[PDB]
């Protein structure tokens, strides 16, 4: 499904992402906007044989298993097809692992490029939270 901005903000807040590891809620919403345009079914194929899945475009080389990516680690221990659900819980739980790993939200290149450095609080303004 395609989420609305405040609808996603509220779902992510319910899942404990607001200020998780130092990143306020606005960061996560902006990341989803520019990674998947708020769509749970977005997928993106990469030159190394991996694919990015779901609303947060989680990658199959390191995080989920899709059965077709060469040096796959499955550090979230989840099949990638679960990340394509309309319900974002598996994506959020794997995103919690990714941001705890090493370089925070730098794992998301659309965040890195288009969110970081802006006032990301603007992405939850006007939302009932």
UniProtKB/Swiss-Prot annotation:
Reaction(s) catalysed (UniProt annotation): Hydrolysis of (1->4)-beta-linkages between N-acetylmuramic acid and N-acetyl-D-glucosamine residues in a peptidoglycan and between N-acetyl-D-glucosamine residues in chitodextrins
Gene Ontology biological process terms, A to Z: cell wall macromolecule catabolic process; defense response to bacterium; defense response to Gram-negative bacterium; defense response to Gram-positive bacterium; killing of cells of another organism
GO cellular component, one term: cytoplasm
Keywords in alphabetical order: Allergen, Antimicrobial, Bacteriolytic enzyme, Disulfide bond, Glycosidase, Hydrolase, Secreted, Signal
Enzyme class, spelled out: hydrolase
Primary localisation category: secreted
Family from the record: Belongs to the glycosyl hydrolase 22 family.
Name of the featured protein: Lysozyme C
UniProt organism field: Gallus gallus (Chicken)
